[model samples]
Target: KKIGLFYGTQTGKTESVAEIIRDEFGNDVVTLHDVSQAEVTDLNDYQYLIIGCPTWNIGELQSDWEGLYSELDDVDFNGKLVAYFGTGDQIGYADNFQDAIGILEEKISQRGGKTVGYWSTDGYDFNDSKALRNGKFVGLALDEDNQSDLTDDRIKSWVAQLKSEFGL
Candidate 1:
């Protein structure tokens, strides 16, 4: 059950997360360009995907993912298990936190990809256990380098639950 981790990074943060997943999961991870780089990739080879980006506006997608995502509209990327991740500054750039992630999720799902149930954060903190009002979830706290210093346990827990539910 190899998985692909596709990221659209504005300030390189999303790529960092993808790298973490790659390091943890080994052969189960891939970048969006990696498929194209190989000159041929059957999406069916993988059962799960992860789409990540950073918020530009109020839940708006970062520029890079938007263009690639637009291409998915022409393809039937259906039934693929997917999830979203984003980096934002809720306390500072609160107006833009999580905007891009939602856009990615909505547009990607429209092309047939199914999303995992959770979203992790890099900086935003506008949500809670009681209610999730934003698109990018504040699951982890971001550090000064615009990353969440999360342990493998947290990442593994989420991954396990997702894999179990989706049969990935």
Candidate 2:
């Protein structure tokens, strides 16, 4: 099966995480797309998707992703399996950590996508987050500003979890 890995970034950290995810999944199984350059219809070609974006300015989505908001609402995600990951400064924005993942998940769900790859919140120190659901994160949440050292292992395990979740 093929997976479309999409990401949007400002300082390139989110895209860097996207690269790690793609590397973990391997080139044959994943294709990367920069939201700044991707068309909304491009998602139609894949049944499995992994989306990444960073939360900025007190919980706002990255600029490129914000640009696709309305257009993404119109896309059909029926039968698609989507996973999410987000970059955030957990220490700096503890109240709204990784909120973009939650925002993106809602849009995908509204269009009928089945979300997967929920990550545990055990190590994170955030006080609150929209990405929290049933005590777990909506997806992998990475804090590059404060916890860059953990990012690699987090992606490794998250990708392994997704392999099973996606039935690969």
Candidate 3:
């Protein structure tokens, strides 16, 4: 099945992660869309989706995602499998680390999306996070500011997990 990988970014770190995800899935199997220029209906084209976003000042969504955030409630995610990856500063924003992922997951859940790719929280050190559900992250969480060295391995393994979760 095809996958639609959508992402929103300000400093391009989130976008860069999106590229890695897309590359792992390859161009033929996955298509990338910038949330800044995407429509809600675009999600209808793929049964499997990977959405990425970065947390901004004080637990806010990136500018592009904030613009499209309201329109997400208009779409339907019935029977779709969605995964998420978010960029944040775990040390700097410990209380709200990767909050944007939780925010988007909430919207997707309200719209009937089935989420996957929950990542382990073992390596991260944070005061609190909305992204935590059942002691695991709602999705993959990356900290470029403090844990940049771990990104490649995290994405690699996350992508590998998604391959099976999505049933390829």
Candidate 4:
């Protein structure tokens, strides 16, 4: 299945993650977009979506996503396959690590999307996060600043889950 991978990055971590995901899925199947430059209306063109963003300013969304966050409300995500990936500094912002994913997940679900790829918090060491729900992250969370070594494995595992969930 083809997927649209949209993301917002401040220090480029999130974008790098998005590109890694795209590489795994292949460009033929996954098209990446920087939310700041891509049209939010284009989101409707695909049935599967993977959103990436970083948490900032004490749990706030990255600036790029902030610009288009509300535009998502106008799109109907019913029957669509959706998931999230977020970059954060777990060590520095333990209380809000990858919190933007939680916010985005809420928006997607509210639009009636069938969200998938909820990740286990097994390997992470964090104080707390709004991204946690029922003892699992709302989506995949990466700590590039402190745990860059684990990013590849996390992405591989995440994409495998997505592949099954999305029937790709």
Candidate 5:
């Protein structure tokens, strides 16, 4: 089935999740800009869609994707398999973890879209721990390379949720 794996990333965390989702769902799952660039005429063309955005000023959706959200108001998402997720620092912002996800999920649902789930990364391990047990995540040592490394187990578990909830 065709899918739209869209993300509104600021720190690249949301985009990273979108890319991993794309890899599992294949090339048809693409970014919002990719859909617009392809001159897609109808939302119905896609069987599934994932939405993501970064939290901004006092729990707001990121700038780049705000436009995309507005555009969905005119479209219909009757049987679409959609999900919402986001990334932001919980220590810094009070609602960073679920704010962006909540924003997009609400907007999309208001426009007749249903969510597969809200897949957030706020509690996920991101290279902040000294030791990892079997249930712990081994995050990448991110620096110059933005595409960080993650343990196979971490990715597996993350993907497994999608497969279970949304059937990949």
Candidate 6:
């Protein structure tokens, strides 16, 4: 099985971020899809799954994910690897930043997926977030609104984390 990267985008930032991650592994190594345009028939098809979305509307999941969110219940995630990431305004939305990532993380966990790439919450100045647990983020988190310049470095670090976990 190979890697599959799925994303839900609004204003295209999430997709751009996904592209960076896709390019990290090379397109041939990682299959990428816009979750809105493509149907993810089965999670079992991919050994490693990466999902991205934007935290929006006061901690709500991205609009596109609502349509397919329930579908996760049917996915057989036992032994499948998963990781999550999202763009949010950590400064403006300090109370709810990256909440969508936390929501998706819970869903994926409920389905029995083995998730990796839990990231350090260092350097981010946020009051709180559902994405934070035990003093660390559930997965990679980004702040394009307030920290756009740090995005590339954050993506590189995250990609490296996943690569190590995947034994690449």
Best by lDDT: 2
Q: Name the lDDT of candidate 3.
A: 0.88
- Give the Å error, residue 51, model 4: 0.1
| Local lDDT at 74 for model 6 | 70
lDDT of 6 at 156: 93
- Evaluated at residue 83, the lDDT of candidate 5 is 61
lDDT score of residue 148 within candidate 5: 33
What shift in Å separates residue 112 of candidate 1 from its native position after superposition?
Answer: 2.6
Q: What is the lDDT of residue 20 in candidate 6?
A: 85
Q: Of the candidates numbered 2 and 3, which has the greater lDDT value?
A: 2
Model 6 off-target regions past 4 Å?
none
Give the TM-score comparing model 5 with the true structure, all chains together: 0.64
Q: After superposing candidate 3 on the true structure, give the runs of residues whose Cα lies further than 4 Å from its correct spot.
A: none
Question: Which regions in candidate 2 have their CA more than 4 angstroms from the true location?
Answer: none
Candidate 1: stretches off by over 4 Å: 27-46, 58-60, 119-124, 127-147, 150-154, 166-168
lDDT, residue 40, candidate 3: 80
Cα lDDT of candidate 6 equals 0.83
Q: What C-alpha lDDT do the candidate models reach, one value each?
A: 0.54, 0.89, 0.88, 0.86, 0.50, 0.83
Q: Give the range where candidate 2 is weakest over 10 consecutive residues by summed lDDT.
A: 56-65
Tens digit of per-residue lDDT, candidate 4, span 1-168:
479889888888888888888888874798888888887788899999999988876946778888888788889999998999888888888888888988888988999888899999888888888788967998998887888899899999989989889898
TM-score of 2: 0.95
Q: What lDDT is reached at residue 2 by model 3? A: 84
120 in model 5: Cα distance from truth in Å?
8.5
Full-model lDDT, candidate 4: 0.86
Candidate 5 or 2, higher TM-score: 2
lDDT tens digits, residue span 1-168, model 2: 499998998889988888777778875799999999999999899999999988886846778888888798778999999999988888889899998989889888889999999899999897988889967989999988899999899889999999999888
Give the Cα error of residue 27 in candidate 2, in Å.
4.8
Tens digit of lDDT per residue, candidate 6, span 17-71? 8888888876477777788886647455887898888887794577778777878
